[PDB]
Amino acid sequence: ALTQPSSVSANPGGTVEITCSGGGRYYDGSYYYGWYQQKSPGSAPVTVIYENTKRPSNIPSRFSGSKSGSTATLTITGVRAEDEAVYYCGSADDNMNPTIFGAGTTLTVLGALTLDESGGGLQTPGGALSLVCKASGFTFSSYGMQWVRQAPGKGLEWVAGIQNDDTGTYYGAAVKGRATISRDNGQSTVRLQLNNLRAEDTGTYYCAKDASSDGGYGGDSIDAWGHGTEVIVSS
Numbered sequence: 727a728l729t730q731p732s733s734v735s736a737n738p739g740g741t742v743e744i745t746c747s748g749g750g751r752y753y754d755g756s757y758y759y760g761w762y763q764q765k766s767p768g769s770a771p772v773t774v775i776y777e778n779t780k781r782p783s784n785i786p787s788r789f790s791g792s793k794s795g796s797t798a799t800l801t802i803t804g805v806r807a808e809d810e811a812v813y814y815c816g817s818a819d820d821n822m823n824p825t826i827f828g829a830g831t832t833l834t835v836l837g838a839l840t841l842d843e844s845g846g847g848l849q850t851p852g853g854a855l856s857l858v859c860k861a862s863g864f865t866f867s868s869y870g871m872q873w874v875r876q877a878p879g880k881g882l883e884w885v886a887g888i889q890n891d892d893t894g895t896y897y898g899a900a901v902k903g904r905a906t907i908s909r910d911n912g913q914s915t916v917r918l919q920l921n922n923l924r925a926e927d928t929g930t931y932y933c934a935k936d937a938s939s940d941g942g943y944g945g946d947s948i949d950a951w952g953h954g955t956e957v958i959v960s961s
Contacts, residue, residue: 728828730815735834736805744800744831749817749945751796758946759798760816761791762827763809767879768930770953771814775800776937777947784838802833810835814882816945822896825872825884825945839863839950841933846955854921857955859933860914864950867911870894870936870943873918876954877929885931886918890941900926923959930954 728748736742749757758778762771775781775791778798788804798817802809812830819826845857859871873885884898886907897905906919920927936942937949 727819728815728817728826730813730828730831732829733832733834735836736802737836738805738807740805741801741803742805742833744813744815744833745797746800746815746817746828747797748828749796749798750820750823752818752944757793757796757798758817758944759791759793760946760948761798761800762814762816762882762948762951763811764814764830764882765811768876768954768956770932770951771882772951773949774813776949780937782949805833805835807835807837809833812881816882816948818944818946823884823899824894824896824943825874825887825898827874827882827884827945830881839935841935841950841952843931843933843952843955846931846957849923849927849957849959851923851925851959851961853923854919855923855957857918857920857931857957859916859918859952861916861933861935862914864935866914868941870938870941870947871909871916872934872936872943872948873907873916873931874934874948874951875929875931875957877926880929883929884945887936887943888916889943894942925959928957928959930956
């Protein structure tokens with residue numbers, strides 16, 4: 727599991743730093759982290775920094791990222807009230823678990839592409855579900871894709887990933903043996919099947935696009951998130 731502080735406080739106009747450690751070493755011997763801002767539980771995260779230092783152009787320039795050795799730091803220079811959020815760090819855990827999220831850092835300040843998920847709703851315990859994410863606004867066949875979920879009031883949890891060419895599928899510990907991810911490049915869709923459903927599978931399921939230039943996926947490199955679809959497992 728990754729390590730990031732539970733909370734940080736800042737005065738408006740201050741400079742704040744949030745660190746993340748514990749990521750797995752990548753194939754190249756280096757370490758890579760991403761930073762995912764979520765302003766309320768159950769809402770689409772927003773990538774503020776990915777691949778250590780890359781900032782999406784719609785994100786304010788007050789956000790920046792750096793990495794030293796195996797530790798990443800998110801810096802907000804001139805923090806604003808609207809920056810209050812939970813910031814989740816993401817990285818690789820190990821070779822068979824390319825995505826893992828830290829527990830989140832809550833920041834207190836003193837005072838295009840579409841990914842559309844369907845198939846959610848009420849599900850019966852012991853049954854199966856099938857979620858579909860329909861992508862538009864980018865060249866789907868070039869990118870790895872992932873599913874991430876969030877139990878009510880809890881943090882982000884990785885569910886599954888798939889490379890652009892169907893290869894390298896892996897699954898989060900809580901769903902391994904029950905889950906299947908697949909994709910259809912011609913339809914620009916990625917699918918999650920999950921069987922033997924249990925109450926613990928209840929939550930918001932987000933489709934996530936990877937930015938890795940090689941069609942891979944990992945915890946450091948998510949650049950777009952859907953608004954998610956709720957799954958409720960109950961009888």
